[PDB]
Specification:
The protein is mainly alpha-helical and about 160 residues long. It is about 45% helix and about 5% strand. It contains 6 helices and 2 strands. The chain has a two-stranded antiparallel ribbon with strand order 1-2. Helix 2 crosses helix 4. The chain binds one DNA strand of 58 nucleotides through loops. Interacts with C42 and VP80. Interacts with protein 38K.
Length: about 160
DNA sequence: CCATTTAATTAAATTTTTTTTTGTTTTACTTCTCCTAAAGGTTTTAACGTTTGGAATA
């Protein structure tokens, strides 16, 4: 009851809603974290594309593309192996090196969440994917910790307040 | 005181006829079955993702 609950998937007018309702799903905190990670890594991909003097392999949503093979291509970042070796990439701006090296399993679960889009109607098959507890509690919570570490260090790297989420 | 007869009538087997019944045949509607179509739900396949061993390394 508390807060603004008027935003419901019954967004028609009294009779027309009485006839049919908007397509909708169940939202829960864990899928919300999945979405946060998703949007933030979309932002990260956009910034890479912007400062890149080469293509951005992390920007292709095709099928045969697999985060596994791309990871195998690029590999763990030197000063932090949990990250990825984006330091060697080619930027039109001066290479910041390690600065652009996100974690590993975070990107894995990001890609698996992304490949959801093929059939959104099977929403639950990936609704929670990134932050799933499939112990695994430690694994996924520390993955969230690593992701938010990347988020904050990026934000500080460009003066962005951590509160802009 | 009355026996005579025949004249009219009936009765009856006989004939012939007409009908009536029986089996025969032909043909048409009549149900009985299927074929056909539609759609739906049930099953079959597939895909991804999960978790787990398999192999090698630090």
């Amino acid at each position: 009851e508390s807060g603004q609950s008027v935003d419901v998937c019954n967004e028609l007018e009294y009779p027309w809603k009485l006839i049919t309702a908007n397509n909708c799903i169940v939202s829960t905190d864990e899928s919300r974290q999945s979405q946060y990670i998703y949007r933030t890594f979309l932002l990260y991909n956009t910034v890479l594309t912007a400062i890149l003097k080469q293509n951005n392999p992390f920007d292709v949503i095709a099928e045969n593309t697999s985060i596994s093979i791309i990871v195998r291509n690029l590999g763990s970042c030197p000063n932090n192996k949990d990250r990825v070796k984006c330091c060697d990439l080619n930027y039109g701006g001066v290479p910041p090196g390690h600065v652009m090296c996100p974690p590993r399993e975070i990107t894995k679960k990001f890609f698996h969440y992304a490949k959801w889009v093929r059939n959104p109607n099977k929403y639950k098959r990936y609704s929670e994917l990134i932050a799933r507890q499939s112990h695994a509690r430690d694994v996924s919570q520390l993955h969230l910790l690593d992701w938010e570490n990347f988020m904050g260090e990026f934000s500080s790297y460009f003066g962005l307040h951590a509160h802009n989420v």
